[PDB]
Amino acid sequence: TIKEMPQPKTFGELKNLPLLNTDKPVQALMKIADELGEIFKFEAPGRVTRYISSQRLVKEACDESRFDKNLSQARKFVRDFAGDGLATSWTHEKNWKKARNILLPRLSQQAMKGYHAMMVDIAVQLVQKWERLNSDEHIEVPEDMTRLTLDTIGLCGFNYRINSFYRDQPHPFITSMVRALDEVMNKLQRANPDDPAYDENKRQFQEDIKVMNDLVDKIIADRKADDLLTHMLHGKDGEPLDDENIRYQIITFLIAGHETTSGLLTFALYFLVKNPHVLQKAAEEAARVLVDPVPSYKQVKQLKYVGMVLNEALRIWPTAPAFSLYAKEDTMLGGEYPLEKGDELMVLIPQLHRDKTVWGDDVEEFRPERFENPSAIPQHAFKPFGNGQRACIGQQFALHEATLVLGMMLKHFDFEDHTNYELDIEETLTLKPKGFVIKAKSKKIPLGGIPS
Numbered sequence: 001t002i003k004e005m006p007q008p009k010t011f012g013e014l015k016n017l018p019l020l021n022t023d024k025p026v027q028a029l030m031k032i033a034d035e036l037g038e039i040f041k042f043e044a045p046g047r048v049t050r051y052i053s054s055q056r057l058v059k060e061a062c063d064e065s066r067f068d069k070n071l072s073q074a075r076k077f078v079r080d081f082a083g084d085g086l087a088t089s090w091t092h093e094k095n096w097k098k099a100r101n102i103l104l105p106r107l108s109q110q111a112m113k114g115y116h117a118m119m120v121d122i123a124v125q126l127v128q129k130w131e132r133l134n135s136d137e138h139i140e141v142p143e144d145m146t147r148l149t150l151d152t153i154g155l156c157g158f159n160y161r162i163n164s165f166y167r168d169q170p171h172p173f174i175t176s177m178v179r180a181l182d183e184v185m186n187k188l189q190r191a192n193p194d195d196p197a198y199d200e201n202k203r204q205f206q207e208d209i210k211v212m213n214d215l216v217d218k219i220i221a222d223r224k225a226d227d228l229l230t231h232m233l234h235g236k237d238g239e240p241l242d243d244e245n246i247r248y249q250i251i252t253f254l255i256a257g258h259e260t261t262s263g264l265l266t267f268a269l270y271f272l273v274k275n276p277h278v279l280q281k282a283a284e285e286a287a288r289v290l291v292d293p294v295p296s297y298k299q300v301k302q303l304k305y306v307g308m309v310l311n312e313a314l315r316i317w318p319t320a321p322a323f324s325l326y327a328k329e330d331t332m333l334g335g336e337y338p339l340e341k342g343d344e345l346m347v348l349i350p351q352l353h354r355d356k357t358v359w360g361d362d363v364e365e366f367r368p369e370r371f372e373n374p375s376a377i378p379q380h381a382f383k384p385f386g387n388g389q390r391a392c393i394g395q396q397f398a399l400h401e402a403t404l405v406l407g408m409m410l411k412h413f414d415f416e417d418h419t420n421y422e423l424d425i426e427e428t429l430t431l432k433p434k435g436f437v438i439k440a441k442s443k444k445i446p447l448g449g450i451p452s
């Protein structure tokens with residue numbers, strides 16, 4: 001009762017690779033897996049991957065006795081600029097689990113009691129910039145969501161003030177990060193990599209890894225002249241971290257610790273303007289809960305419905321959209337698809353969150369009240385933060401940051417979807433709505449003990 005594995009139209013020496021000559025590869029890999037089922041094979045020269053989309057199979061892949069963690073084929077390149085160091089190392093690494101058990105305890109729920117104040121500091125900045133737009137003026141959502149999420153990691157994680165809001169044009173580091181990823185992403189759709197046709201391109205990329213390093217120089221310099229870098233320097237295990245691997249860990253968290261989080265907020269706010277009854281309902285929760293000008297740690301933990309709106313928007317659109325895995329031994333999967341040792345499966349997350357056998361037929365509706373009883377979401381049907389001993393380390397940081405902010409936004413403004421924005425999701429590894437803009441009617445509620 002073995003079953004042959006599916007596969008998209010191959011085109012020659014290229015195999016299936018030319019089905020990814022598009023700038024929305026994930027979005028297209030869910031049209032493929034949309035037809036070819038819960039699993040389908042994917043060959044591009046000298047690399048093969050299986051794509052699992054059903055909870056039925058994901059729940060096996062996450063069985064850590066069968067499967068270990070893997071580097072996306074995107075990850076080995078984003079390793080040409082990150083780890084050895086957490087988000088781009090294999091479990092079989094030394095400056096992984098040492099590099100993780102220095103930081104893990106700094107990222108718990110309890111550790112957020114400490115970051116909370118600086119998180120509220122950057123949040124106030126974003127709210128007030130909106131209080132001070134002219135009439136005609138609209139909001140660039142993903143654009144301002146980045147201003148925040150980045151400032152906030154820089155500041156909680158590295159006690160450095162990036163002052164992203166004191167700048168009309170996206171911070172250098174972000175313009176360069178974006179252009180560094182689009183490369184990694186196209187250098188993946190490139191049929192002949194080592195070519196001179198791509199030559200102005202791997203020198204561009206280097207200029208960009210310099211701008212990004214600039215800001216990293218600036219953050220260490222500022223420290224010399226209990227943050228997340230106070231350990232990344234003086235945290236033992238039993239080895240503190242070394243010369244070279246620390247400027248890695250830094251660029252690693254400046255990226256991981258904001259991008260995916262900016263994604264989640266643009267998406268949530270999108271979904272809310274399109275479902276104005278959910279906006280209304282979280283807008284009340286926020287009014288009812290945040291009764292001081294600024295929120296307390298205590299208060300942010302009681303934005304229950306807002307936590308829910310975040311998870312729902314994370315179901316419908318995981319911003320870190322896929323994670324990889326390898327087989328630890330030869331094995332059946334599903335009892336049908338037989339894998340060798342080392343074979344690679346990719347967890348197409350946005351599709352797993354659309355598995356109707358686990359969710360309903362309304363998998364495409366925005367309904368935050370699914371997450372009322374979170375004991376109702378089945379084993380493994382939901383994983384925006386990866387799975388297992390390599391779950392997203394910064395999940396509790398992300399969710400607190402994101403609730404706090406979505407919570408304040410909804411306390412001080414009504415938003416109008418003024419352009420009838422039709423969704424367009426730019427892909428730079430991670431997903432984020434592109435050119436999403438709205439207007440905000442302020443509720444004229446004072447903040448900080450400051451009027452406007």
Ligand code: HEM
Pocket residue numbers: 069070086087100253256257258260261264318319320321322323324383384385386387389390391392393394395397398399
């Ligand atoms: C906001 C602060 C965040 C930080 C500092 C952060 C950092 C990290 C780190 C260090 C890892 C690797 C952990 C490990 O290997 O032990 C990771 C993995 C991951 N993160 Fe995050 N992250 C953040 C937010 C988010 C958000 C909002 C999402 C939403 C989808 C997300 C999605 C993921 C996913 C899917 C992985 C899986 C990697 C894999 O297992 O292959 N992250 N993150």
